[PDB]
């Protein structure tokens, strides 16, 4: 029954509309949902705007009137210029009159702010269409009507605010360049009058609502107006004193002054410098006397969250940081301005103690700006000594776990603060460390925080004081650990001791005996079953190795051998209690050390001894798994095998090219294992169905295949000897993986195969033209058929697929030339199919492949293949590119779309396409591709966007084609087109902007 309002043959029952609206906003459940679907259908009715005058007049429901204005908004925005001229004036008069009457009724003006704001915005939309060319007296009459009524004056400030926003803040995307410039110049030409009104209201008072609405509009003006309106008037005085005292106006005034601190200002005038100092001086004065003194605990204030205190403290931080980052130098020379400078920063110190992450990041960005300047700028740091000393404590106490982003920012500022005064930094940290020992500030969180801080200032001190400091820190940390009972407390402190030493490699390198003791102790922790200790031991081990690897590979004094040998001799015993992942980290860390040995005979010997355990386990399995293959059904054998390969991946990751000898030890048997495992997966899917791929047994088997592929990928990507890669690795690899991939059902194909091949083509693709062809033959068509039915299925395959085509198109384009025409046609289909993705990973590659393909064809010159390509696929790429450019569903790809399109158009206007792109019959002979290209596009756009005039399409194409050597301008023209297609009656002259 609610669906009655959707019948436009009969009169609209406003009472029925008010019921449907009420049922939507105030109702609930099924009825609310039903009303919602009805209101949408009503609003979306193209004739609904006609019934807007009835609703806005007869309805008593403010929500219904709001929805009516929304219907009108759509009409003005999109179809305004299509209306008869009479209807344009009617709507305008109706909207103006409506706003006037709402302002006159103090009851309505008071209780229907949302409906009045909506009406004002609706007025502004009319202005964007009509003003000033068809409404030159709008601003003069607006200023006139202001003096008559406070409510009207206040509302006029809301209109001017919205106008300024639509023209200067939100115009770039929503209107053409020409139209934007027009409205900007129009506002600019009449602002002299607008400011006069605004300044008079502010200076004469006295309605707070009027003042606040005026200051809110002023905030928008400050985004674009010339600085003279701010400095050549008394308005800074008003903001920085009068309006900072009242809390009603304090919030907005502070935002205004924050923007004033960003105005375009001539920095050679001394009078303006005085003004800039003055309003800051006045503002900090009002805050000290009206809000809180510089000593106030802002941390506690913020936490209490009374009223708008939090927003205020946020805005104060923004104001202080913004102004001081630009103008603090104005306060540093004058002795009489010193107190102001330091008080301003003292507020920031207090603000930085607030517990609020995003606010802290804001102050921390400023502190970084300051300490960086004090670090380079002469004679400045002594001024801020007391501020910097406080800051050291603030940052040390709020140091976070290494968000890592925030840690890096905290470390950076603290490293600066360490240079500015090393002695003060040391004193604070040791002091804090003493308070951890006397238990006054003892806490798991507090000891961790301090350890992160102490570790962050590494390699900033003197090697000598660094040593002296580290010894002091560790020695005291060592004593702290004894003091605590229970492994809970002892585990925390012990971990912090390992953290700090891992942060000071310069110290460990200089004292081998100590470093050696550290590592042996980490090996003890690899047996501790206490939670986190084993991970902590392994993380620290590899962390230290990365930084001190040279001291593990060389024969140190008072040692019979390099320590790396000692680690390997007991590697079984050391890693016996570790989890598989932890064991892999251990082996990878050994690989880091081994790779430093530049003696090939020695490096390979160390590699053999390191891989002794996995190679014996491997040899045993390969021997018993090949006789008989039943062993692979055992989950344990599958897990053992996967771990062996993972260990090879871990070592290969850190050793790269040097891993080759170890790879050769297992390579041929490994590929045989890949075949055996593959047969079992197929056998399982045959015997159990596709559900088999979900079972642990098959997932275990597939893991083996994937780790094998990962190992090969890891080595080839880092190989220095590409001859061996080609002549030893590639052919057996391709024989083992390609046919298996092609002849598996879709749900059994590993996407890692595609990724592996991407790496192969990347490194040696230029050397295996026959190999690349074999790769395409085996993966191209069958993978495309997996992913060309929707954008959803087989996401991994989808991404790797286009990465593979991408690298093949770059490295071995000849492989595509060998494709049969039908297969090449699929290749083109595949590229375009990639355009239509929302998936970033797929879309970008699709566009790049297209661009690179065009360049590939171009480099062929005037040859039969290139000419046929253009005849077949040029206009396909042009129209497909245009489609995603204009459909409003691929806006994330605009730039590359623009580039691809610019390249395609330039080909014709540089006459790089030798053959005609048209049928010999459809156009007269001798016609240039340039002419035919204009015709094709004109016809294309005409049918795709029939609401565009022929002149629009013509001007756009004329501008587009002539600008195909200037990307930023070209893109401008495209943006203007995307705006014009959203509306009717766009101006063809807009395209003459550039």
């Amino acid at each position: 029954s609610m669906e009655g309002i959707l019948d436009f043959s009969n009169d609209l029952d406003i009472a029925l509309l008010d019921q449907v609206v009420s049922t939507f906003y105030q109702g609930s459940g099924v009825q609310q949902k039903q009303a919602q679907e009805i209101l949408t259908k009503f609003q979306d009715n193209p004739d609904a705007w006609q019934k807007a005058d009835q609703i806005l007049q007869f309805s008593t429901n403010p929500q219904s009137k709001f929805i009516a204005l929304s219907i009108l908004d759509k009409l003005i925005t999109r179809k305004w210029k299509l209306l008869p001229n009479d209807h344009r004036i009617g709507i305008r008069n109706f909207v103006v009159g409506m706003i006037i009457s709402m302002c006159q009724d103090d009851e309505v003006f008071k209780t229907q702010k949302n409906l009045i704001n909506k009406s004002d915005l609706t007025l502004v939309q009319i202005l964007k269409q009509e003003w000033p060319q068809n409404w030159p007296e709008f601003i003069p009459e607006l200023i006139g009507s202001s003096s008559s009524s406070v409510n009207v004056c206040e509302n006029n400030m809301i209109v001017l605010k919205l106008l300024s926003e639509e023209v200067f803040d939100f115009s770039a995307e929503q209107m053409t360049q020409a139209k934007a410039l027009h409205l900007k110049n129009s506002m600019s030409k009449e602002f002299e009058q607008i400011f006069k009104l605004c300044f008079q209201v502010l200076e004469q008072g006295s309605s707070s609502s009027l003042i606040v609405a005026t200051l809110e509009s002023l905030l928008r003006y400050l985004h674009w107006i010339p600085y003279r309106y701010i400095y050549e008037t008394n308005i800074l005085e008003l903001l920085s004193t009068k309006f900072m005292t009242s809390p009603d106006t304090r919030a907005i005034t502070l935002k205004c002054l924050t923007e004033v601190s960003n105005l375009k200002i001539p920095q050679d005038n001394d009078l303006i410098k005085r003004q800039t100092v003055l309003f800051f001086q006045n503002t900090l004065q009002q805050i000290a006397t009206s809000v809180m003194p510089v000593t106030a605990d802002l941390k506690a204030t913020y936490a209490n969250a009374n009223g708008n205190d939090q927003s205020f403290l946020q805005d104060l931080a923004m104001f202080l940081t913004t102004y001081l980052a630009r103008n603090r130098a104005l306060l540093e020379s004058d002795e009489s301005l010193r107190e102001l400078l330091l008080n301003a920063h003292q507020y920031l110190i207090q603000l930085s103690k607030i517990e609020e992450r995003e606010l802290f990041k804001t102050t921390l960005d400023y502190w970084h700006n300051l300490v960086a300047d004090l670090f380079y700028e002469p004679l400045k740091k002594h001024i801020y000594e007391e501020i910097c000393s406080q800051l050291r404590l603030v940052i040390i106490e709020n140091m976070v776990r290494p968000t890592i982003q925030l840690y890096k920012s905290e470390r950076e500022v603290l490293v600066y603060l360490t240079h500015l005064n090393v002695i003060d930094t040391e004193e604070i940290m040791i002091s804090k460390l003493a308070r951890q020992i006397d238990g006054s500030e003892w806490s798991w969180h507090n000891i961790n925080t301090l350890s992160w801080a102490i570790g962050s200032i590494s390699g900033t001190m003197s090697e000598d004081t660094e040593k002296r400091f580290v010894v002091t820190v560790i020695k005291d940390l060592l004593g702290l650990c004894e003091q605590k009972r229970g492994k809970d407390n002892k585990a925390v402190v012990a971990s912090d001791i390992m953290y700090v030493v891992g942060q000071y490699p310069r110290f460990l390198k200089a004292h081998w005996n100590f470093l050696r003791t550290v590592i042996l102790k980490l090996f003890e922790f690899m047996h501790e079953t206490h939670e986190g200790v084993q991970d902590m031991a392994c993380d620290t081990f590899i962390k230290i190795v990365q930084k001190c690897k040279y001291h593990f590979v060389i024969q140190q004094p008072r040692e019979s051998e390099p320590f790396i040998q000692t680690i390997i001799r007991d590697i079984q015993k050391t890693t016996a209690d570790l989890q598989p992942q932890q064991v892999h980290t251990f082996y990878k860390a050994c690989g880091i050390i081994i790779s430093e040995e530049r003696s090939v005979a020695e490096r390979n010997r160390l590699l053999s001894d390191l891989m002794q355990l996995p190679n014996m386990a491997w040899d045993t399995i390969v021997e018993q798994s090949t006789a008989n293959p039943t062993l692979l059904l055992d989950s344990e054998t599958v897990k053992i095998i996967a771990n062996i390969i993972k260990t090879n991946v871990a070592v290969c990751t850190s050793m790269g090219a040097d891993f080759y000898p170890q790879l050769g030890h297992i390579y041929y048997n490994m590929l045989q294992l890949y075949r055996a495992v593959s047969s079992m997966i197929s056998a399982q899917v045959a015997a159990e169905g596709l559900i088999a791929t979900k079972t642990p047994k098959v997932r275990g088997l597939r893991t083996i295949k994937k780790e094998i592929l990962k190992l090969v990928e890891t080595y080839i990507s880092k190989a220095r000897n590409l001859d061996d890669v080609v002549k030893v690795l590639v052919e057996p690899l391709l024989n083992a993986v390609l046919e298996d991939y092609m002849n598996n059902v879709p749900d059994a194909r590993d996407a890692e195969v595609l990724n592996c091949m991407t790496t192969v083509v990347e490194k040696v693709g230029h050397m295996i033209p026959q190999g690349v062809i074999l790769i395409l033959q085996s993966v191209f068509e069958c993978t495309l058929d997996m992913i060309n039915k929707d954008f959803t299925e087989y996401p991994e395959h989808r991404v790797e697929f286009y990465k593979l085509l991408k690298v093949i198109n770059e490295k071995s384009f000849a492989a595509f030339l060998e494709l049969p025409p039908a297969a090449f046609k699929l290749f083109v289909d595949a590229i375009c199919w990639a355009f239509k993705h929302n998936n970033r990973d797929v879309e970008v590659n699709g566009l790049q492949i297209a661009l690179d393909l065009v360049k590939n064809i171009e480099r062929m010159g005037n040859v039969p293949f290139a000419n046929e390509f253009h005849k077949n696929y040029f206009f396909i790429f042009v129209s497909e590119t245009f489609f995603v450019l204009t459909d409003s569903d691929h806006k994330s790809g605009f730039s590359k779309q623009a580039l691809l399109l610019m390249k395609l158009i330039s080909l014709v206007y540089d006459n790089k396409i030798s053959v005609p792109l048209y049928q010999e019959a459809e156009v007269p002979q001798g016609t240039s591709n340039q002419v035919y290209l204009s015709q094709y596009l004109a016809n294309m756009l005409s049918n795709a966007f029939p609401h565009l005039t022929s002149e629009q399409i013509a001007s756009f194409l004329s501008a587009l084609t002539k600008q195909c050597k200037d990307l930023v301008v070209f893109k401008g023209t495209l943006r203007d087109f995307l705006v014009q297609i959203k509306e009717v009656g766009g101006d063809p002259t807009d395209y003459l902007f550039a």
């Binding site: 010894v471 560790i474 020695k475 060592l478 650990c481 492994k487 002892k490 585990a491 012990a494 001791i497 004292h511 005996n513 100590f514 003791t517 550290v518 042996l520 102790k521 501790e528």
Partner: peptide, 14 residues
């Protein structure tokens, strides 16, 4: 278990 005595030793020399 947790006993950093050897670290205290090697550090007290240097």
């Amino acid at each position: 278990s947790f006993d950093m005595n050897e670290l205290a030793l090697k550090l007290a020399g240097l």
